[PDB]
Amino acid sequence: HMHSVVQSVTDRIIARSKASREAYLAALNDARNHLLKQEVGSVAQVAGVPCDGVTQGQPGMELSLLSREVIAMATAVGLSHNMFDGALLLGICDKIVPGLLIGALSFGHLPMLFVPAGPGKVDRAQLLEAEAQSYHSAGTCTFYGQLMLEVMGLQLPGSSFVNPDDPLREALNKMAAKQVCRLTELGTQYSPIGEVVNEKSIVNGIVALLATGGSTNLTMHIVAAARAAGIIVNWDDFSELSDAVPLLARVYPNGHADINHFHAAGGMAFLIKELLDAGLLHEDVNTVAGYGLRRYTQEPKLLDGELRWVDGPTVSLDTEVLTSVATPFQNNGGLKLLKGNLGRAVIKVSAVQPQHRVVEAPAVVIDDQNKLDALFKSGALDRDCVVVVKGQGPKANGMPELHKLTPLLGSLQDKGFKVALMTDGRMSGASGKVPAAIHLTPEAIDGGLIAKVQDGDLIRVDALTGELSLLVSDTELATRTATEIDLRHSRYGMGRELFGVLRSNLSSPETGARSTSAIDELY
16 A cells, blocks of 8 residues: 555666666576674674774765775675675664675675664663663653664664663674574575665665655665665655655754654654555565564564564654654655756755745855855855855765855855855755755766856756756857866875775766666676
8 A cells, every 4th residue: 555656656666677676686696506883894794704984084074985885895805705694784874884785785695684783871771671661761861962774674673773782782683693594595584685675675765764854965875775786766766755755753963852862752663653554665575574564663672681572652752853644844855856957966955944945046156165264254155146066076076075065055044145055065964944956967077067157157946846057058158168176185185095096987976976886787
């Protein structure tokens, strides 16, 4: 009983991935026929024998996306010893996990499980893990101030929210080990990761990303992970799914409540039940815990020393943090595609007031986010304008998160000016109140129309119709020469010398910003 939009988009993805997915699974068959994590992420391998961390400096931030590719390759090297009947993956989040996932799908014939570490007066959370206290008591004390792997059934149900030092966490580490052995090709329950990752589970990951108000960074990683598995997903999928997926959670970047507060309110077991009930998640999937996604509506407990899974909550205890689909924060995910002569981008409109969703204003062009403050201080932005930030894509400088953009433009909007952002890069990944067209493609150095934009040019960002237009004629654009962007300082320093070949081959954000190839593209 699936929602018509989710069923439609799923079918579209299946159709579009037909050949690539068939080739991936054929290759997989050929392959058959043959605690403190300040950064210790590793790949443990089964039948038990035991990888690169994070990178978010200042110029080190220009290696963050690139480190996913490095993690993927490093995973492949570890697994290339080929004496494993299955594997275990020990990874944090955001930059790590997608990299591991990508690398793991190269060995898609093996069963695998992700083993999370988890997220003070730690007394209460332990009492809850062990029956001693109810959800009521956990909720109230967190009130006094990896989700993708959950919906995709790539780790044990409710395993990511157990505190690291907890004896339940110890039990869940033991169960993870035993379970992979049961998922081996030997028989009974053969569940290879390249099969657990499929069109339905990918779609499931997207809707959960949308229902939780997750980072726009994960849009690239979901697409990169899926591509590795022969599954082709684009921005039309995200934008059209968003229209059907309600917003159900307010987690820190959007509000004050942290992940533990989210969990105490009801958590993934509640969210997944709601989406299942609404026909927003595919139930008919194989997971690392067995068949059927309804297994992920259950929560682990350590009762009398015995690890048990019990029924999760059916009501939210805190409707300011977590909500039901009947009465959501918003009846959609706020992720929209923008198209026009400028190309293709995405926008989060979730925190953008309807009055601010359409901006038509003269352009203000910079090729470095640091140039913005001097322009702001000279009063050059104290008017309606679209601030264009170019040379910020994957190929230009490794696509660093741009944190210096939203605050000033927000204050410009607050003063009553009509303002918008347009970049071939990205911000923190969070949702702002200022309309921002992000991940613009083709990027400036790829010859995208953004490179020809001049100060004064009218740019229309219309999040209502999905239009992104530079209001100059094709003929006037033929006369223009794009200004040369000086990238010399983005090419060396902080180890950047090492990544020129990878950075230069990064694909478009919509194609996952990959430097790697999928099995099927060479099969």
